[PDB]
Design a binder for these strands. Sequence first.
RNA 1: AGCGCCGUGGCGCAGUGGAAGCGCGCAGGGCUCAUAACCCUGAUGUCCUCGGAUCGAAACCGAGCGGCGCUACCA
RNA 2: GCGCAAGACGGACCAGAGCGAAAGCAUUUGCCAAGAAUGUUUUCAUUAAUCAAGAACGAAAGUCGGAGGUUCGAAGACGAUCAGAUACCGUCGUAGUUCCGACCAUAAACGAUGCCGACCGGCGAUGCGGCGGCGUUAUUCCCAUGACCCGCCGGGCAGCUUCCGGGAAACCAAAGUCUUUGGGUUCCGGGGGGAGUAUGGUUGCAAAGCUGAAACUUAAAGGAAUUGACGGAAGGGCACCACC
RNA 3: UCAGCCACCCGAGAUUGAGCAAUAACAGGUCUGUGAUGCCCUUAGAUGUCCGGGGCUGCACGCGCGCUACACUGACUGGCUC
RNA 4: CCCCAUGAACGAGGAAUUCCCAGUAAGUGCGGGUCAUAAGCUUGCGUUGAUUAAGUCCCUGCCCUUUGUACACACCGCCCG
Lengths: 479, 24
Amino acid sequence: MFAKAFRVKSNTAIKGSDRRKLRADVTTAFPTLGTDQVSELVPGKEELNIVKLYAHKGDAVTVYVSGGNPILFELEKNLYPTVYTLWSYPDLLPTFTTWPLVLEKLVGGADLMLPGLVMPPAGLPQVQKGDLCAISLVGNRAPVAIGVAAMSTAEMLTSGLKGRGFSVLHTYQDHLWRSGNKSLQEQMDELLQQCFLHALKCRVKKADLPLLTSTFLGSHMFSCCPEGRQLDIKKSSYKKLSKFLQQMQQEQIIQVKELSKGVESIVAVDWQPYHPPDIKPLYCVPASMTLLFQESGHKKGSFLEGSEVRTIVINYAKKNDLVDADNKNLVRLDPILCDCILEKNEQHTVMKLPWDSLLTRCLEKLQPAYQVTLPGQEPIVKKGRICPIDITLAQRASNKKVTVVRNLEAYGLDPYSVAAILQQRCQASTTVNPAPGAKDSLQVQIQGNQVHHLGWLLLEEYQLPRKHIQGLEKALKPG
Amino acid sequence: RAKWRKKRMRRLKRKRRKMRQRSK
RNA sequence: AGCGCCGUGGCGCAGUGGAAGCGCGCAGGGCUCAUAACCCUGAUGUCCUCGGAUCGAAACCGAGCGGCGCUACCA
RNA sequence: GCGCAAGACGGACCAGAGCGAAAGCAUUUGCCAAGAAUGUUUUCAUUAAUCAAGAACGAAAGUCGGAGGUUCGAAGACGAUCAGAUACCGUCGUAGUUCCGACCAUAAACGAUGCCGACCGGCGAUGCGGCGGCGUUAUUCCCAUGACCCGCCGGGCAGCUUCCGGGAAACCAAAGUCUUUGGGUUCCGGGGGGAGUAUGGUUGCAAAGCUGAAACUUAAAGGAAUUGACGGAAGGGCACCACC
RNA sequence: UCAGCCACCCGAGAUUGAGCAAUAACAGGUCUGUGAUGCCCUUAGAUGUCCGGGGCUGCACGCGCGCUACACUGACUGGCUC
RNA sequence: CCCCAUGAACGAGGAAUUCCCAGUAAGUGCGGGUCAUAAGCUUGCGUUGAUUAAGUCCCUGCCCUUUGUACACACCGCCCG
């Protein structure tokens, strides 16, 4: 149902009667355990919205939502739970275990064929045609799909397993899953001087500096938590801080002085996100070189690191006996190397190349590429040089200057968040507009000449290398 | 304009009523 | 695994055979004291490659390349 | 086009008209209690004017419970305009708009003019009651009564007019009877900002309300009217260096 | 029935074309027209002058007045009269 | 300046816009200024001699009346976060 990315026509807030009818229909569908958990999933004091979708095929889908969580969805007909709602409450639907070979295709949105469910790893309990069910696997403990039976279980087992057993309505990592949401001096001086000296020694615990003891007593925090140490010096045997500074200074721990203002100053005796990204270079094998890589197992389109290209070329120069006898630094070129890595003027000229030259030529003949690992995710492979975030200044309207920022998404930056942050930093009007070329690519437009603040944002806040940013010299100031 | 800085004053005052709570 | 659709200006696209244009963009200018828009002028490509038809073509045959979509997918 | 249902709202008649302490108040019919003015050769015999404390009502929005959800509709979501519009335009649309029951006590709640009383130029109008008066009408004569018509009297909403006098002037028959300064009384202002903010107190479920500073800052801020210049205001007017 | 406006007649003529041009102003052009000037600079290898050459005239480009034409009511060739 | 040759762009001109109401536009030649030799410029002069209007504020520009104004170095003004 959701296998394609689908937009939203509208969102409707539901009145009390329609709300009650909807819950009555959920209670009828599921067991009455639904109702017992509804009060949790659908609180009466919270807003209840229905999200109206238009499919690419012209189908009107509705996704029932309270508190941001998609709960159930329907087409014209009975309500179905989202895979996330079902992961929390698995007992609201009958379950069916499927063979492994089906799994991959089950997460491709494909219907569940009959033969998948009687092969020995699969299992098949008793359900009628039209009933809603959770699709499960042996090696996986959560429902990978939501589907409806097109045939009763008996008929499935019996028929010789031909035709569609279960229509797959919902699956893991479809668009509905990707949306995922809609919009006593002993004790007291021991504790005190322990945690207080330890908070007089490291950093931000201050090492050795002249500083007020008060500031330190009210400094109970280390690493964004309190030490749980809260104590007032009034709990000590010292009715004044001057006496505490008389004792603590006597122990070869602190030294003492009084400021002219009257504070007591002591000089101690010394006794949610990240900004992680990963970038690696890659080399793609063009057609012209395929022969050279035939022995390595790599064909046209294969992505290789530099180390692999060096190992493959070295292995190719050793296996074909191309290494010169009297010089082990030279490689005699056979017809394949001569064809792929040599120019037209060198075609019959150069009979031999050193390892440096051969490896550099082989690396330059390959198509440039790169791989970006943005943590939490699988590597994404791209063709060409790593594209730098592009900052451009344009003169528009009448004497109105605009700053445009491009290729943010290449680095995994959301154009909207960045537009907001820039709106607060620069304090002007920001917008997010479609960008030239590509397909869906976004650019961020700030009203003014802001580039120094982009310097602050990118170089300081996000700690991106200077080599990944372009056009910073046209800036008003270095920032 | 008057109406709006009266409004702004009430915003600010609500915020101050939050930042200083009788728990402080 | 296939079928279609594509592979024509910088950017998107037309083109029902003598054989390249439309719109935006870009260099200019007219209107206003002047610029911006607004108007008017300059210009802008082996038509995916390979081989073939065709008196002779992006327009027609196939071999493919990629990428789009489209599927329907018996995995 | 025919019927049905629901909830809102009472068009035109409607006015510088009426009624109310003010908010406010227009379909018919009945029921319930008030109320001003008028009429009076009725009764009581100073019972009266104004009001700290304290009490009653108090538009809209807002808040709690309930019912109800047609229209409109903050929030939100799109579509446009735009250099940019999270805005004016447009489609959708939550709270609310409606009724019942509890809170809130604030509006440019404005006649920006406290209340009681006395005096001071006219003139037409109007609303309500009374008094008087030819004449018309409800058909033809008698009285009632009603409709017009001509006046007089007392309250009202207003109007026009004026060298009454005020007033900084706009304007005002009250803002008049003020250096020729005293009829009674309540509230209340003291250059502009800072600020109706801070704090304490107090009322509230909450939003807020009432009471309410100082440090500092500053030569003006302001009100009427007068000539200008300008306006994307409304009028006229010209010119073949404007057009036809 | 007032200014004046329209038609016609009598007539050379029922509209001849320029010059001069007010109270005011502009921070318009004018040290380069003045033996008309307030300042500043230059003043004897002169920003002075005279002598001899070059240059204001230069050329991938825009914008302006103006000339000449794109022909048959014309170009050429002779002839006649203002 | 004059004689021969050379003989090219130019096919009534896009958006826009200038000047003009009767001896007038327009064609045409002439005199003065500048000038030792010089008018594709200017300033005057006649000659040939009309088409269309005798109207209007649409455009543009300025004048007057009423009106609003927090402007008066006067909208290229003042001014708010």
